Ligand binder design. Structure first.
Ligand code: NI
Length: 179
């Protein structure tokens, strides 16, 4: 798994470039970031739909949602045929912050990660069954630039729950393009 981190004053400058599985979590998790890795016990093979895949891990999230009983639960994954996929990540590109934690578990496909805490930025690029949770009140965004039908688990929340922006600047629009 790779992990790129840049400063806020200059993006072309990386203050921490490395690819470790443990040294990665220790870096972000050291900043209050969540980390974990779940796997299936049965042998998977021809899985055309994730509906069956999530059911194999639902038990795991079934415990997380049980306490944080969110309003609803669903997964984000459309077909690369939808032309609004790029427009969808755009409206989400705007920076923001939710009053609750934003748990994101990856099930298939690779995307991009962006955790902004204090004056620094974090960019993770690796698709493992591992997930990362963002704390409530932490500035962050989300961009899937190239999306080939990615399978991920997201929670359903209302807007009045999160605020649009704190300063109004869009720094996220800086790394919105994937690869
Ligand atoms: Ni968010």
């Amino acid at each position: 798994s790779a992990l790129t981190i840049f400063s806020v004053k200059d993006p072309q400058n990386s203050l921490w470039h490395s690819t470790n599985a443990e040294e990665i979590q220790q870096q972000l998790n050291a900043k209050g970031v969540r980390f974990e890795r779940w796997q299936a016990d049965r042998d998977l093979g021809a899985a055309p739909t994730a509906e069956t895949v999530i059911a194999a891990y639902q038990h795991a999230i079934d415990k997380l949602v049980a306490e944080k009983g969110y309003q609803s639960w669903d997964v984000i994954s459309l077909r690369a045929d939808n032309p609004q996929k790029e427009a969808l990540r755009e409206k989400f590109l705007n920076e923001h912050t939710h009053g609750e934690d934003e748990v994101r578990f990856f099930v298939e496909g690779a995307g991009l990660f962006c955790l902004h805490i204090g004056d620094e930025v974090f960019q993770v690029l690796c698709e493992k069954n591992d997930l990362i949770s963002v704390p409530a009140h932490t500035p962050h965004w989300f961009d899937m630039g190239s999306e080939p039908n990615f399978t991920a688990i997201r929670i359903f929340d209302n807007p009045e729950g999160w605020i649009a922006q704190f300063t109004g600047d869009d720094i996220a629009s800086a790394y919105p393009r994937l690869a």
